[PDB]
Amino acid sequence: SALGKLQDVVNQNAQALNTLVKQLSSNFGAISSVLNDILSRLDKVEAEV
Amino acid sequence: DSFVIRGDEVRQIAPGQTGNIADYNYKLPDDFTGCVIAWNSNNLDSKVG
Numbered sequence A: 001s002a003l004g005k006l007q008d009v010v011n012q013n014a015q016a017l018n019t020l021v022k023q024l025s026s027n028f029g030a031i032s033s034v035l036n037d038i039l040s041r042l043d044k045v046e047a048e049v
Numbered sequence B: 001d002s003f004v005i006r007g008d009e010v011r012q013i014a015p016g017q018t019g020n021i022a023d024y025n026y027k028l029p030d031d032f033t034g035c036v037i038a039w040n041s042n043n044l045d046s047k048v049g
Helices: A004-025 A035-041 B020-024
Strands: none
Touching: none
């Protein structure tokens, strides 16, 4: 518990990188967050949206 | 461009469309800039038999 100033630098960057990665799985209101769904289920004019 | 159709087929003449007319007869670009203009031609083009 004494090294809080250094351990917090490692923890904050671990949280930042893991949150940036987990956001790949978010839909953002799109039909799916898996791009291969859109690339196989939809025609180009819908897939672009 | 110009051509004859049956009255069902109009919907395939739009930017980046698909189906037998679009894909095997006459294909518009996916980014087509222009106007599509059409009329019933039964009076010009039909004949008995």
